[PDB]
Write a protein that binds this ligand. Structure first.
Ligand SMILES: CC1(C)CCC(C)(C)c2cc([C@H](O)C(=O)Nc3ccc(C(=O)O)cc3F)ccc21
Length: 237
């Protein structure tokens, strides 16, 4: 029935808005750490960054638990899905927080870092790609509910590796794909290419993620002391 899809659109949307505050509703603030020029790594900036990344991972898990059906999956699958799609969601999240005019990216507590600071915070040689990915996301003018659905689709993925019940995860994903097409087309009937442009983004996203995992390999050498435990859980993929 249609009322069940509208119900799913509503739940996913609320689940996202509650685990991911919008840019416009955020109390933006700045820091003066290494804003001047690019350096290998500003450690004070990386502590605050890892701290925020860990908080986001928890918010991602929180969001995943509110997605209809996820909890019914085996606990092994739930972990497997999160493990595989966490960086992807993480990348999509910070990218929806791009303010093109100031050329900054805002975090959930309001920390607003300019490109130089993002670089010095840990992004390193991947900074510019991330920023270019966020740029090219702007033209799609997605909203909170579309980002939420898109994020769910990245998560509920049957093609993952150690799934015990891949066939069940595929069925869970089915309505999210219907839900997103129904929603995207209704909001904007004049641009029928939004849905397929959104799905194709999942591929782009997945790519900026493998580069991000790759960047975490290097970073581990540059930082004094082990990377946070939840961040490490995610990278063990
Ligand atoms: C694996 C690890 C720790 C090292 C490699 C790089 C620097 C590439 C990276 C990049 C990201 C991600 O792109 C991001 O910043 N997401 C992000 C999104 C939202 C918030 C928030 O709203 O608070 C915080 C974030 F952290 C996350 C992890 C990592």
């Amino acid at each position: 029935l249609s009322p069940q899809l509208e119900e799913l659109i509503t739940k996913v949307s609320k689940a996202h808005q509650e685990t991911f505050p919008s840019l416009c509703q955020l109390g933006k603030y700045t820091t003066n750490s290494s804003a001047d020029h690019r350096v290998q790594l500003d450690l004070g900036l990386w502590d605050k960054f890892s701290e925020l990344a860990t908080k986001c991972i928890i918010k991602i898990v929180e969001f995943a638990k509110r997605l209809p059906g996820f909890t019914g999956l085996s606990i092994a699958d739930q972990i497997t899905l999160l493990k595989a799609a966490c960086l992807d969601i993480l990348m999509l999240r910070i990218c929806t927080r791009y303010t093109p005019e100031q050329d900054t990216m805002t975090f959930s507590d309001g920390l607003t870092l300019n490109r130089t600071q993002m670089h010095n915070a840990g992004f390193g040689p991947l900074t510019d790609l991330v920023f270019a990915f966020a740029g090219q996301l702007l033209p799609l003018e997605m909203d909170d509910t579309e980002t939420g659905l898109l994020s769910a689709i990245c998560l509920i993925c049957g093609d993952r590796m150690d799934l015990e019940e891949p066939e069940k995860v595929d069925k869970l994903q089915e309505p999210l794909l219907e839900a997103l097409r129904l929603y995207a087309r209704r909001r904007r009937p004049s641009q029928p290419y939004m849905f397929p442009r959104m799905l194709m983004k999942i591929t782009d996203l997945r790519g900026i993620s493998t580069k991000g995992a790759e960047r975490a390999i290097t970073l581990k050498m540059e930082i004094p002391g082990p990377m946070p435990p939840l961040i490490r859980e995610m990278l063990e993929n």
